[PDB]
Design a protein around this ligand. Sequence first.
Ligand SMILES: *SCCNC(=O)CCNC(=O)[C@H](O)C(C)(C)COP(=O)(O)OP(=O)(O)OC[C@H]1O[C@@H](n2cnc3c(N)ncnc32)[C@H](O)[C@@H]1OP(=O)(O)O
Ligand SMILES: CC(C)(COP(=O)(O)OP(=O)(O)OC[C@H]1O[C@@H](n2cnc3c(N)ncnc32)[C@H](O)[C@@H]1OP(=O)(O)O)[C@@H](O)C(=O)NCCC(=O)NCCS
Ligand code: NA
Lengths: 427, 427
Amino acid sequence: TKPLDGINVLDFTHVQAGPACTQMMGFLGANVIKIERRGSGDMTRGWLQDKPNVDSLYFTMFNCNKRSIELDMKTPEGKELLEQMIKKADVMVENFGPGALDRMGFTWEYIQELNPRVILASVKGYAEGHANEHLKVYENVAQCSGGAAATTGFWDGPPTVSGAALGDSNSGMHLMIGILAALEIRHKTGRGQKVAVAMQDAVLNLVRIKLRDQQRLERTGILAEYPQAQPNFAFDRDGNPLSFDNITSVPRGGNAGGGGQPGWMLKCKGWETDADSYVYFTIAANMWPQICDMIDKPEWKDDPAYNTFEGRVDKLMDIFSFIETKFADKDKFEVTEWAAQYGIPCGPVMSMKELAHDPSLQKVGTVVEVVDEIRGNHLTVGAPFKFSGFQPEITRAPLLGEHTDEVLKELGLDDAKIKELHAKQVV
Amino acid sequence: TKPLDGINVLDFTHVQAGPACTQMMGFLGANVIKIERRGSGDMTRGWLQDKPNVDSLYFTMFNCNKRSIELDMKTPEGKELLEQMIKKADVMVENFGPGALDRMGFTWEYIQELNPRVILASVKGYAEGHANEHLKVYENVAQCSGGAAATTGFWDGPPTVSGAALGXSNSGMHLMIGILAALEIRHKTGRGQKVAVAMQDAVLNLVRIKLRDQQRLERTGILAEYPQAQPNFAFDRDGNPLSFDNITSVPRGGNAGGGGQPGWMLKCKGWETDADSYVYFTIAANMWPQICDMIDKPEWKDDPAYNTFEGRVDKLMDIFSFIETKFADKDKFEVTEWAAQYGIPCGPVMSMKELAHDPSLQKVGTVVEVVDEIRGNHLTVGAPFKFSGFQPEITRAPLLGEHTDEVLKELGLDDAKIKELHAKQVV
Ligand SMILES: *SCCNC(=O)CCNC(=O)[C@H](O)C(C)(C)COP(=O)(O)OP(=O)(O)OC[C@H]1O[C@@H](n2cnc3c(N)ncnc32)[C@H](O)[C@@H]1OP(=O)(O)O
Ligand SMILES: CC(C)(COP(=O)(O)OP(=O)(O)OC[C@H]1O[C@@H](n2cnc3c(N)ncnc32)[C@H](O)[C@@H]1OP(=O)(O)O)[C@@H](O)C(=O)NCCC(=O)NCCS
Ligand code: NA
C-alpha cells in the first residue's frame, strides 16, 4: 500500500545527508531503526535547540518516522547485536567518516556473508578512488568542492553558498535513488549491492548546466546569455571591466537565468524595507510581442535591435531595468498576477514566513504539521513526490533510546540479557 | 546487469527537469524512447549552440542514452502510435505545461485503461491543488517560489539564485525517486501509479533547514549563529548595525554555515584576479583545539570566552578575519593541506575550469568524456551514485528523428505504413 512497506532499514545515519535519506524512506513506508550513540545520540539533538531540555527542530525535522536504539558499537556485545540486526535488514545506511564502518569490522565483504540480500548505502564527501576520498566534509565545503560556490553570487563579490542544502539533503536524495535502484535489481538477482554517493558528485550533478557553460566558454570564448556578455555592464570591486575577453572559467552571473530562459530578479514595491519584495521575471525568446504589450513598447516588436535574443545581447540589462520601473507601485503578488495574464514565467520571492503559513503547501501535504505531544507540534517538509495510490503518514521523531528495549525484544532477547546489556552499558 | 535493464520509458520530456530524470534512468540501463516535435525537436537542440546547425551542449549533456522519434501528437495517427507505445511502456514521463497531456486525450484514467501496469510521472511548476497550479515555471522562478532565493545571498543585497539547478535537475532527480518508488510498489500490486513532483516542492525539500530556522525565529525571536546576531558586524542600507529585533522571516546570511557548525568564505592568494581563490573554513566546536594549533594561538584554548560556541558568538567574524590573514600568501590548495593535517573541515572553492579537467572526477566516472562520432566528443556528468555490481555505459545523444523508422518497425509497421506517416507529416 506504501512503496516501502516491509522494507527494513538499519539506519546508522546522523547529521543531515544520511537522516534525510532514511526519513524520506520512512515517509514512503520503510521500517527505520536508527542506531544512536549512548547518552548524546545524533549530534543534531543538541544543535540549535529552541527550548532547553528539548530535541532541536534540526533533529525532529530530519528524524520523523524512525525508532531510536542506543548502542555502543565498539563493544563485543554491540557488534553481536549488529550482526543480528543486519540479518533482518533490507538496507543499511551510513554517513560516518571514510572507513569508519570498516574499522568496526563491518566491511562490505563481511556484510555480504552475514546477509546476501542486504543493500549497503553510504554518503561520503568524495567518491572512492578520489584523491580526497579520506576527507571529512560538511555542507558548505561540499558546495565549494562541486562547483556551486564558484558559480553562485555576483561577479563583483565572493563565491557564495546556497541556502538550499546542496551538500547534505541533496546527497541524501541522490542516495535514495541509489537505494531504490539496488532494490529494483535485487528482484532479478536476489542479491544486495553496495551503493555510495559522494557529496561532491551530488553537487556536480545539479551544476551540470555550468559544465555545459565551461565547455561553451572553452569552445567559443563567450556566454551570450550572461550579464558579462553585455558590453560595459559588469565591473569588479575596483571598477575594472568584466568581459569574456579575459574569462576562462564560468563566472558568477548574479541573478541571470541559468538553465531557464534569460531572466532577472526585479524589485517590487517595498523593496527598501522588505528583503523579499522581488519577483523573478523571464524574457523567453518566443514571448517578445507579449512583453512589448505588457510594458507598452509596441515600437520594440518589429525592431531587430529588440525582437531577437541576438539583438538583445547588448542591452538585456537595460531592458530588465526598464521593466522593473513598471513594478514600482505593485507588490510581488500583484506583479505575478499581472505577468500571469500574459503567460510570462514570473513569480514572487516567497519568504520563509510566507511559506511556513501558506495554505496551498499545507493542502497538498508539502508543509505538514507533525503531531508531537512531548515537544509540541512542529512543521516539516513532507514528501515532494505525490502519488495516486497513497499519502505519507508522518509521525514524531523518537526520543533518544525510546525503542531500545522494543527493538531488543524483536531480536528475541529475553528480559535477562536486556538487563545485562543495560548494566554493561551496551545500550 | 544494470538496475533498470528492460525498463521501457516512453519519454515526452523536454528542456532540463524531465530530460535529466530520463537520462539518468538511461544511465542505469533503461530503454528510453524520446518523443520530439517534428522539425525542431526538444527546444534545447537549438538553445545556445556552439556550432551552427549542430545540437547544443544543453541538448547532448541531458539526452545521452536515448533514442529519438519525431511525432505530431495532434494528429489522429500520432495518437494511435502513442497508444501502441504506451502498451509497451513501463513508465511514461512528461513535463509539458499544466493540462497539456490531458488535452491530447491521455488523461491518467485513459492511460490506465490502455496499460494497467504503466507508471505516469510528471514534473510540474506547482503541485496539483495549489493556488498556482496552472502556472508555467522555469528554473529560477521555482528557486524563488520554494524559499531558496529569499535565503541565499547577503543581508545587504537582493534575493540570489543558486548556480545549481535547484528548480530543474533537482526536480528531475526527485521525480526519479518517485518513479523507482512506483516500480517498487508495482512488484506488490501489479499496477502502475501516477507520480508527480512540483518544482516548488523539490526546492523546498532542499530548503528544509530554512523552515527549521523560520520556526526557531518565530519561537525565540533570534537565530544566534546568523551574522545579524553578531554585535555590530552586519549593517543595513542606511549603514546601521543589524539585529533580529525587527527580523520576522529567515534572512540572508552571506557565507555563514547554514547549520550547527559556523563557517565563512575566506580569501586566499590571488583572490583579486582569481574569482575562485577562496576556501570555506568551518569552526566546528569539537575541532577547536585543532584550530588553535594551526592558528598558533594557544591563549584561546584555555580561555572560556573562546573555546565555546557562546564564547565565540560575540566575536566570531573577528577571528574569521584573523584566520583569513594566515591565508593571504597561500593558494587555496596550500591552505587546505595545512588544515588537512589537523582533520579540520576546510576545502577550496573549485572552479568549473578545474572540475571539468580534474583527474579524480574522470577516474571515478563522475566527469565522463562521451564518444560522439557525429558532433565530436564532449564532457558530461555521469552517475553520481556508484554501485558495486555495475558501471554506466554512456552513449551519445540522438540526432532528431534518428530512430523514428527503427521505433516504428518495432511497432510492427511495414515500409508502406512508414512512408505514409512520413508523407502525411505524422513523423
Ligand atoms: S550532511 C553533512 C555531513 N557530511 C556527511 O554526511 C559526510 C560523511 N560523514 C562524515 O564525513 C563525518 O561523519 C562527519 C559528518 C564529518 C562527522 O565527523 P566525526 O568527526 O563525527 O567522525 P565520524 O562520524 O566518522 O565518527 C567518529 C568515530 O565514532 C564512531 N562511532 C559513531 N557512532 C558510534 C557508536 N554509536 N558507537 C561506537 N562508535 C561510534 C565511528 O565509527 C568513528 O570511528 P573511528 O574509527 O574512530 O573514526
Ligand atoms: C517548460 C514549459 C514552461 C514550456 O512551455 P511551452 O513552451 O509553452 O511548452 P508546453 O509544454 O506548454 O507545450 C505547448 C503545447 O505544445 C504541445 N506539444 C508539445 N510537443 C508536441 C508534439 N510533439 N506534437 C504536438 N503537440 C506538442 C503541448 O501539448 C502543448 O499543447 P497545449 O496548446 O494544449 O498547451 C512547460 O513545458 C512547463 O511549464 N513544464 C512544466 C515545468 C517544467 O518542467 N519546466 C521546465 C523545467 S526544465
Ligand atoms: Na499594453
